[PDB]
């Protein structure tokens, strides 16, 4: 993990991606709950081809998902709804309004639209989309790790290491885009920050909502 | 406010800096923690408002918009202010100077802890004061600028060229320390990761938390 270099971290993220799930007013929520559900089984998969995940204990990788997992759902929704100025393409067959929000919901919806809206306005790319996903899978769980074991300890800074590779690929693309060094540094803080926006969203959908052992079964493959 | 050097803007926002209250308790007296707490965090929330208005550029946007940022970061700010005021303080947390409570008095039980391991990271990585001040105007000028007409764009607008300033200051001030350009740009997104989980956080808070504030805010902008 930590020996890849940016190319082939870029490379590993876009080959990691899971499919776009297709869907199946009062059953919109048991449509959308569906969805979520079958795309939690591609987000394991997905979760363990992001370099370094699968080298922590299972514990730790439950720790991490059961944190960051609405907060990925909601950053991959916002990604296929880009170039759907209003609409939130939940699937291809199920693009929706903010009338069709209208339960506390529509406050998350203006909320995720607004996130679309503002990677529309930054022309967000898609190999800076993978790389933000990733780190919100490591980082958005690693402050709540209960216990500092050695082990834990280890963890932690591995977890770390991992995250300032992608903050050095993300870099990378960036100047590659013939980014300016000054230009760089803002559009990372920029990315970095809507991150905090995400976890915000992610609160409040947990809140609307009101998982480990499903995880843990999901992780703990045999070979 | 776009006009300034990265060392003019460190110096404002350090003149800036709110000072340290006191808990309002006799401490000549049996020893009421939430109402302690409450009371200093009304107080504290004046001092901030008066800080505010000395971030660099926060006072060019319309009042409306000064109070829809306030009103979506203050627990953020009063948050990241204990953090920093107990990280030489390990397993506690520094609420006043007369009022240091460990896990034990704080049964707020999650929150305390979550707090404790910020301030631990903090103190890990030897989070100095001239970036401290900087974190704490990026949450002020991000942390509701989401959440807002050809004004707003330009208020919008405004409030990012102003981030984009203190983007530029932490990443002098890195430089300064003698930071290679890869470990700037590895300290800033650690220190901007932070924020997300200072913004988790404040939302727990006011979870655990539940005249409009918005008016009083108002009334302490004037
Ligand atoms: C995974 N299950 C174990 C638990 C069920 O999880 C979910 C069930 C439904 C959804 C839905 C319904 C939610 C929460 C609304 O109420 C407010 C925010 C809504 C989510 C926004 C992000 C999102 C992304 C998806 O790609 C699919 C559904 C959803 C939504 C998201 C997660
Ligand atoms: C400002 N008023 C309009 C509303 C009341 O605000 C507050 C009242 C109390 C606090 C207290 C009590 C809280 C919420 C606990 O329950 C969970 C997290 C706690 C806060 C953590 C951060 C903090 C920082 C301060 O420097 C002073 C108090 C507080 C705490 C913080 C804000």
Request: net charge negative; aromatic share 6%.
């Amino acid at each position: 993990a930590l020996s890849l270099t940016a190319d082939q971290m870029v490379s590993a993220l876009l080959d990691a991606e899971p499919p776009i799930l297709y869907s199946e007013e009062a059953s919109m929520m048991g449509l959308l709950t569906n969805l979520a559900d079958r795309e939690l089984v591609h987000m394991i998969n997905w979760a363990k081809r992001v370099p370094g995940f699968v080298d922590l204990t299972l514990h730790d990788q439950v720790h991490l998902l059961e944190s960051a997992w609405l907060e990925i759902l909601m950053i991959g929704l916002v990604w296929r709804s880009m170039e759907h100025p209003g609409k939130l393409l939940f699937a291809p067959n199920l693009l929706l309004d903010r009338n069709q929000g209208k339960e506390g919901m529509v406050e998350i919806f203006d909320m995720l639209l607004a996130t679309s809206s503002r990677f529309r306005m930054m022309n967000l790319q898609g190999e800076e989309f993978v790389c933000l996903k990733s780190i919100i899978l490591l980082n958005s769980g690693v402050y709540t790790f209960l216990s500092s074991t050695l082990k834990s300890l280890e963890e932690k800074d591995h977890i770390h290491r991992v995250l300032d590779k992608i903050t050095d690929t993300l870099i990378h693309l960036m100047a590659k885009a013939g980014l300016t060094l000054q230009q760089q540094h803002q559009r990372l803080a920029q990315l970095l920050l809507i991150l905090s926006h995400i976890r915000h969203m992610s609160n409040k959908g947990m809140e609307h909502l009101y998982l480990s052992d499903l995880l843990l079964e999901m992780l703990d493959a045999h070979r």
